[PDB]
Structure formats: C-alpha cells, structure tokens
Design an enzyme around this catalytic site. Structure first.
Site, PDB file in Angstrom:
ATOM      1  N   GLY A  46     -39.752  -4.512 -22.501  1.00 44.05           N
ATOM      2  CA  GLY A  46     -40.856  -5.090 -21.718  1.00 44.05           C
ATOM      3  C   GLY A  46     -40.303  -6.293 -20.985  1.00 44.05           C
ATOM      4  N   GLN A  51     -41.648 -14.470 -17.029  1.00 44.34           N
ATOM      5  CA  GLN A  51     -40.299 -14.616 -17.577  1.00 44.34           C
ATOM      6  C   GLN A  51     -39.161 -14.702 -16.554  1.00 44.34           C
ATOM      7  OE1 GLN A  51     -40.907 -11.194 -20.498  1.00 44.34           O
ATOM      8  NE2 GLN A  51     -39.583 -12.554 -21.684  1.00 44.34           N
ATOM      9  N   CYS A  90     -37.990 -11.569 -28.123  1.00 42.48           N
ATOM     10  CA  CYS A  90     -38.356 -12.041 -26.790  1.00 42.48           C
ATOM     11  C   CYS A  90     -37.058 -12.351 -26.072  1.00 42.48           C
ATOM     12  CB  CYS A  90     -39.342 -13.234 -26.854  1.00 42.48           C
ATOM     13  SG  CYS A  90     -40.465 -13.574 -25.521  1.00 42.48           S
ATOM     14  N   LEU A  91     -36.912 -11.832 -24.843  1.00 40.58           N
ATOM     15  CA  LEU A  91     -35.793 -12.168 -23.973  1.00 40.58           C
ATOM     16  C   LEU A  91     -35.715 -13.664 -23.631  1.00 40.58           C
ATOM     17  CD1 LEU A  91     -36.075  -9.070 -21.689  1.00 40.58           C
ATOM     18  CD2 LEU A  91     -34.319  -9.514 -23.495  1.00 40.58           C
ATOM     19  N   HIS A 132     -47.838  -7.999 -26.260  1.00 45.13           N
ATOM     20  CA  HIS A 132     -46.808  -9.029 -26.174  1.00 45.13           C
ATOM     21  C   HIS A 132     -46.613  -9.456 -24.705  1.00 45.13           C
ATOM     22  CE1 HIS A 132     -42.775 -10.854 -27.051  1.00 45.13           C
ATOM     23  NE2 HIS A 132     -42.677 -10.591 -25.751  1.00 45.13           N
ATOM     24  N   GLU A 133     -46.503  -8.478 -23.799  1.00 41.32           N
ATOM     25  CA  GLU A 133     -46.394  -8.804 -22.380  1.00 41.32           C
ATOM     26  C   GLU A 133     -47.650  -9.436 -21.843  1.00 41.32           C
ATOM     27  OE1 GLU A 133     -43.409  -9.008 -21.526  1.00 41.32           O
ATOM     28  OE2 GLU A 133     -42.666  -7.620 -23.075  1.00 41.32           O
ATOM     29  N   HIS A 136     -47.693 -13.107 -22.323  1.00 41.38           N
ATOM     30  CA  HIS A 136     -46.913 -13.900 -21.307  1.00 41.38           C
ATOM     31  C   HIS A 136     -47.778 -14.315 -20.087  1.00 41.38           C
ATOM     32  CE1 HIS A 136     -42.940 -14.043 -22.947  1.00 41.38           C
ATOM     33  NE2 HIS A 136     -42.878 -12.743 -23.113  1.00 41.38           N
TER      34      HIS A 136
HETATM   35  O1  LIG Z   1     -34.615  -5.908 -27.519  1.00 41.22           O
HETATM   36  C1  LIG Z   1     -35.665  -5.799 -28.143  1.00 41.22           C
HETATM   37  C2  LIG Z   1     -36.515  -7.081 -28.299  1.00 41.22           C
HETATM   38  S1  LIG Z   1     -36.797  -8.031 -26.791  1.00 41.22           S
HETATM   39  C3  LIG Z   1     -38.035  -7.405 -25.770  1.00 41.22           C
HETATM   40  O2  LIG Z   1     -37.750  -6.352 -25.251  1.00 41.22           O
HETATM   41  C4  LIG Z   1     -39.430  -8.043 -25.494  1.00 41.22           C
HETATM   42  C5  LIG Z   1     -40.608  -7.051 -25.717  1.00 41.22           C
HETATM   43  C6  LIG Z   1     -40.969  -6.653 -27.137  1.00 41.22           C
HETATM   44  C7  LIG Z   1     -40.067  -6.090 -28.033  1.00 41.22           C
HETATM   45  C8  LIG Z   1     -40.444  -5.709 -29.307  1.00 41.22           C
HETATM   46  C9  LIG Z   1     -41.753  -5.881 -29.693  1.00 41.22           C
HETATM   47  C10 LIG Z   1     -42.665  -6.438 -28.814  1.00 41.22           C
HETATM   48  C11 LIG Z   1     -42.273  -6.816 -27.544  1.00 41.22           C
HETATM   49  C12 LIG Z   1     -39.678  -8.553 -24.034  1.00 41.22           C
HETATM   50  C13 LIG Z   1     -40.341  -9.924 -23.681  1.00 41.22           C
HETATM   51  F1  LIG Z   1     -39.565 -10.864 -24.247  1.00 41.22           F
HETATM   52  F2  LIG Z   1     -40.126  -9.809 -22.401  1.00 41.22           F
HETATM   53  F3  LIG Z   1     -41.616 -10.394 -23.476  1.00 41.22           F
HETATM   54  C14 LIG Z   1     -35.990  -4.421 -28.742  1.00 41.22           C
HETATM   55  C15 LIG Z   1     -36.945  -4.251 -29.775  1.00 41.22           C
HETATM   56  C16 LIG Z   1     -37.198  -2.977 -30.309  1.00 41.22           C
HETATM   57  C17 LIG Z   1     -36.507  -1.845 -29.841  1.00 41.22           C
HETATM   58  C18 LIG Z   1     -35.554  -1.989 -28.821  1.00 41.22           C
HETATM   59  C19 LIG Z   1     -35.298  -3.263 -28.280  1.00 41.22           C
HETATM   60 NI    NI Z   2     -41.410 -11.786 -24.431  1.00 42.76          NI
END
Ligand SMILES: O=C(CSC(=O)[C@H](Cc1ccccc1)CC(F)(F)F)c1ccccc1
Ligand code: NI
Ligand code: NI
Ligand code: NI
Length: 160
Positions: A46, A51, A90-91, A132-133, A136
């Site tokens: 996401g 962001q 979160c990125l 989550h998005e 933001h």
């Molecule tokens: O890299 C992540 C975590 S970071 C991420 O992608 C956030 C989104 C997110 C990931 C996991 C759960 C809820 C939200 C984005 C944010 F920071 F933009 F708002 C990931 C988690 C689960 C499976 C594969 C990858």
């Molecule tokens: Ni995030």
C-alpha cells in the site's frame, strides 16, 4: 518516476488531506503511475499520497490476493464490530512492525483514477491494508493504535 517517501516525524503525515478533483486527467494518471512505481521500489503492498508529500485523498494498494487498485476519495465503513489483530509495518517507519487491531470486515467506496466508481466489501488482510492507508489520509499512523507494546519492535528481531 520514483518519489521519496517521507518518514514519521514529518508534519506532512499529520495533515487531513483534501479530496481529489482531477479524476480522468493526465496529471492524476501520472501521479498514480508514480505511486505504483514508488510502492513497487519500496516493496510495499500500500502507499498513500501523503507519504510522498502529496496532500490528496489517494492511495494505491495490492499484491491471500489483494487486487492492484488505485483509489481516490476513499470512504470506509465497518460491516461488523468484529476486530482482528495482525502485523503491520509502514514505509514511513522502516524496520518496525507491531500488532494492530482492525475491523475484520469493511466496505470501501471511492473512484478509480479514470473516474469510474469503486465499491467493494473486503475482509482480513485486504481490509487491513485499506484501513491503514485510509488512516494516512486523516493524519494517523499505526503507533497510535498499538494496544500491546510488547509486539512493537524491529522486523529482524521480533519473535512474537
Ligand atoms: O512490506 C510490508 C510492510 S510495509 C507496507 O506495505 C504498508 C502497508 C501495510 C502493510 C501491512 C499491513 C498493513 C498495511 C504501507 C504504508 F506504510 F504505506 F502505509 C509487507 C507486509 C506484509 C506482506 C508483504 C509486505
Ligand atoms: Ni503506512
Ligand atoms: Ni526490489
Ligand atoms: Ni469471506
């Protein structure tokens, strides 16, 4: 064009973003394409426009398969009160993760970049990404939602 992701502490992540009003435009299409590229380079599932310091109600998401989606002017509503715990990172908070409760079931509405309406029911991980998005867009980050601080920690270290 890959955009710099801003990090927690930047006041720009604390804003409440305005609505998108250039649906179907070349400018929005270029912004969304930038967002997918940025998300992709960062290995996210996401990314919300605040962001990358773009103050708009716009997110992209997708990857239990979550359809690749660009969503403007999102509105979300829970479909029950059932909460579920799951891992989030979160990125804008690199290296960390925590367990966060979210609604297990939601509906989300808004618009695709071309202006057509989107309306979907979602559950589990799909629903969590979207919540989550959406946070933001209203200036909210996941640490303000942690209930169990034992779960908050660095990805390579955590054994919860
Ligand atoms: O890299 C992540 C975590 S970071 C991420 O992608 C956030 C989104 C997110 C990931 C996991 C759960 C809820 C939200 C984005 C944010 F920071 F933009 F708002 C990931 C988690 C689960 C499976 C594969 C990858
Ligand atoms: Ni995030
Ligand atoms: Ni890569
Ligand atoms: Ni189901």
């Amino acid at each position: 064009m890959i955009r710099d992701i801003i990090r927690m502490g930047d006041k720009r992540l604390l804003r409440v973003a305005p609505q998108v009003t250039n649906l179907g435009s070349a400018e929005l299409h270029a912004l969304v394409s930038d967002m997918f590229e940025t998300m992709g380079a960062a290995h996210g599932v996401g990314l919300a426009a605040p962001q990358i310091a773009v103050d708009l109600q716009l997110m992209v998401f997708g990857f239990p398969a979550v359809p690749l989606t660009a969503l403007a002017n999102a509105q979300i509503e829970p479909l029950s009160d059932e909460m579920e715990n799951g891992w989030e990172g979160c990125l804008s908070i690199p290296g960390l993760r925590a367990v966060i409760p979210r609604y297990r079931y939601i509906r989300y509405r808004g618009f695709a970049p071309d202006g057509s309406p989107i309306e979907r029911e979602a559950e589990g991980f799909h629903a969590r990404v979207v919540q989550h998005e959406y946070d933001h867009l209203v200036g909210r980050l996941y640490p303000s939602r942690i209930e169990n601080f034992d779960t908050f920690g660095f990805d390579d270290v955590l054994s919860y």
